Amino acid sequence: SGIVQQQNNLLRAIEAQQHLLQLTVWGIKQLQARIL
Amino acid sequence: WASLWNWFNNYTSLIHSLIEESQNQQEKNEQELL
């Protein structure tokens, strides 16, 4: 059961990393808009 | 941008919690199953 729980743990980590990644994408597009 | 920094902060702390819990569970699985 610890293996199945660990798969949930890593999936949740991957999901939170994706939200952080999308925030960095937002910032890059905003920086590009102000520079050009 | 101020809101962006606050969201960066909230997600960084959330991710560290999820990683820590994954580390603890990995050590538990290694001891309980190996």
Interface of A with B in 1-30 (CB under 8 A): 2-3, 5-6, 9-10, 12-13, 16-17, 19-20, 23, 26-27, 30
Contacts 24+ apart (CB under 8 A), A4-9: A5/B25, A6/B22, A6/B25, A6/B26, A6/B29, A9/B18, A9/B21, A9/B22, A9/B25
> What 3-state DSSP class applies to A18?
helix
The reported resolution of this PDB entry, expressed in Å, is 1.5
Place of tokens 């952080």: A20
Element (H, E) at B1: none
Q: Which of A3, A35, A29 is nearest to B34 (CA)?
A: A3
